[PDB]
Design a protein around this ligand. Sequence first.
Ligand SMILES: [Mg+2]
Ligand SMILES: [Mg+2]
Ligand SMILES: [Mg+2]
Ligand SMILES: [Mg+2]
Lengths: 108, 148, 140, 43, 59, 40, 155, 153, 71
Amino acid sequence: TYSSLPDDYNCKVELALTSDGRTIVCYHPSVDIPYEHTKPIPRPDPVHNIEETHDLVLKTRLEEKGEHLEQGPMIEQLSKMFFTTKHRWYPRGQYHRRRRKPNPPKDR
Amino acid sequence: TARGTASRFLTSVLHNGLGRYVQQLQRLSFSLSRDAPSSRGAREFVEREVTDFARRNPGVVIYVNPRPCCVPRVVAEYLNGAVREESIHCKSVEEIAALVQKLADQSGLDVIRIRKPFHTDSPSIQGQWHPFTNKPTTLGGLRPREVQ
Amino acid sequence: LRSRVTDRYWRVQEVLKHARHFRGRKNRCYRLAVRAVTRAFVKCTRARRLKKRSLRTLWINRITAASQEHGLKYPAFIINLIKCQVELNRKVLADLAIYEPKTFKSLAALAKRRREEGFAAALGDGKEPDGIFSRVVQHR
Amino acid sequence: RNRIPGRQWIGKHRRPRPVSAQAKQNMIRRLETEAENQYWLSR
Amino acid sequence: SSFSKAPQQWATFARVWYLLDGKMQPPGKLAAMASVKLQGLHKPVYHQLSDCGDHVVIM
Amino acid sequence: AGSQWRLQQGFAANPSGYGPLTELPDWSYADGRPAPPMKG
Amino acid sequence: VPKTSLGSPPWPDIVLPDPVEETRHHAEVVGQVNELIAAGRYGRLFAVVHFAGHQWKVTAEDLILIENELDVACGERIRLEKVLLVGADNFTLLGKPLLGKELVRVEATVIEKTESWPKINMKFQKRKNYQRKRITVNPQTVLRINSIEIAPCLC
Amino acid sequence: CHVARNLAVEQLALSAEFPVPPPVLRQTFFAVIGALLQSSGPERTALFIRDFLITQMTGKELFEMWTITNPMGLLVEELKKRKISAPESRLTRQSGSTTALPVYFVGLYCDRKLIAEGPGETVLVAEEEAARVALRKLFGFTENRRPWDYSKP
Amino acid sequence: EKDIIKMLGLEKAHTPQVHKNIPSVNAKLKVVKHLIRIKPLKLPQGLPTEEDMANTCLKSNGELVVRWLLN
Ligand SMILES: [Mg+2]
Ligand SMILES: [Mg+2]
Ligand SMILES: [Mg+2]
Ligand SMILES: [Mg+2]
């Protein structure tokens, strides 16, 4: 057994040279992740807004969540959330909004 | 200029040439004159090489219209519905033949800047690279500084 | 015989049609558009020349990334793929790096094996030992 | 702060740019080529 | 390999968090790999216009 | 790159020099009949 | 034996296998890949082929655009002879520097023989009254790669 | 309708309301198909069908046109048919869990053997994608599958 | 030096040219020896005859093969 690169990341390379010498073959079967190298799926399900008196109000207690901030704090929150700067979330003018291609080409 | 003009990707009409090749040139309408000195090349082409072209390409309908015109034209209509109007004003018979052969070989798509000189549907044979394709899995799927 | 120009409308439009996507008075005024369009065309040619270098640099960077992902440096990878008479340009190598991880890993393993063979040969200084992948095949 | 008087590579006081090992190797390679040339031009 | 378009795109352009110990390490040799991983020069799908950039946590 | 290795082995310094990658015809008809020669 | 920082080279020692065992393993691997090709257990094949001065990575039902005109008519099939590399999900054949025509066969149909968009080429010199504008129209061809076949003739 | 409009059937179809609505275009295209079947042979008509309708499946996926709703349910049903007990979902790889754009890889293990793996922005989406990948692998409609045979038998 | 390189037929760079080994040309080769690489023309299979003129090639190591790419 011999291999230039370790066979632990996604494929098992086995190189060979044809008896003629003019061709190099390489058999690389894919590598599957063993069961011992994984962890179970975490499941988080909790309903704390449920009330024993009025379930119709309990269902709305979890849906009536609302919040509104200013442009400044909203952009700061978005920047902290997406790990970016504040300058991306500011709008652009008419000159730049009118010159965007309406139907850009698509591949595949 | 690429930034001034439009662009498109390398595509084919109805997956042409995959199952069978279908000539995209549907019809070819020549409009020329019988007495104008500018339609002389078109007249000689209609006399000599329009029948040979019609026989070589039986899938294109050729119309010929002698009319009192000053600029002889050729209108190619393709299977996608594209209309390409060219002027054969004051051109030799060889030039007419070359223009008609180019129009017959063309596919009718827009002649604009092609972004990629290739077009692959699903080029991810055997897989596509993601940041996890070359990383080893640990015993238990533990993070670097995670204690089990 | 007074001769005046009658097609100046189209003479101006043929130049203004290349400036409609500009900013400022360069897209309207003719005196400012002839200069902006000439610079546009000169830059178009210079960039037509520079696009090849830019794309080759991008391919080289992608090959460095895909090689260091296998613990191999780009010069070593390239020279040891050349020494195996594998004549694949940087464009094809980057395409393989992106869409063929198994093929690129096999290529990197071949390059590492060739490098190890060259190192062992240079260390031993023996003419009778010859590596398996270090054999040179002539034209047939 | 460190100004070069006059032009950069003209005056009595120029830029002190040194010679690198790459340039040394290039010159040595050219010298080897020319030595082989003057050998082949001998007989 | 046989993924759908959106999950394939997500898996390809996903961000990765790397850890880096800086105890008894030279700041420049740390910054070299830190900047490489920040720019995304470790991805064969890298491009200057794409937002390919990974997070680096140096302790 | 690797031009010195090719010069030592005997091939051209550029893979586009008199090698089979450029001397052979790059295509032929599906029926097997030869293609017209290349201008280069 | 003294062990210092520079007493040993700063790289792991490499041990290459025996040449005889290596040749036996190569024969085994080539026979296995040949059995795979004969049984036909490969799903889809891609191929890096040299054509028109460039190298193209093409698969079945592919489209490529060659920037020069070919001496063929539209709808005609063509066998691409310079195949540098073939690959599948499980195996991969590399040429030294090319593959064998009996081993691999790539076929492509000519779709469209057209002209490129007008490319502007302008030269200009400062305050020398030198401007020069040219327009290039390049003849191009479209090739649809139809099939990439491989034969079990692999020694 | 795309195939007919590109083959110029709309220009030859005799019908009022020139747009030729999708039903009328379908009727005309399949009338041409029936005329070809009556004129030439069934083998040639099948070749025409394979060349002008099967080619529209190029680059397309299986579920893009099937549009199933319970991939995991269909997968466990197919496994019960193939005499497999049940697939177990295991989180193979993940990058970020508290961030706004996480990425998870969920694999499906039957008897502690990986059959398929799928990525997603959430664990549920990753599990659904893994189920779809396993379904495609079982049905044979994969990306690395044999391309369609366009030849003359 | 420009004129010597022009009369030696070395206007285009990186293209080999065959010359004699006589002192007449050796003088000019010595004059411009710092701009040229000089090798001896090797003939391992002899001089190309008239039936082998169209099948010859000049290898990079300096040898002129007579039968190049047979069949
Ligand atoms: Mg050039
Ligand atoms: Mg100064
Ligand atoms: Mg000075
Ligand atoms: Mg030339």
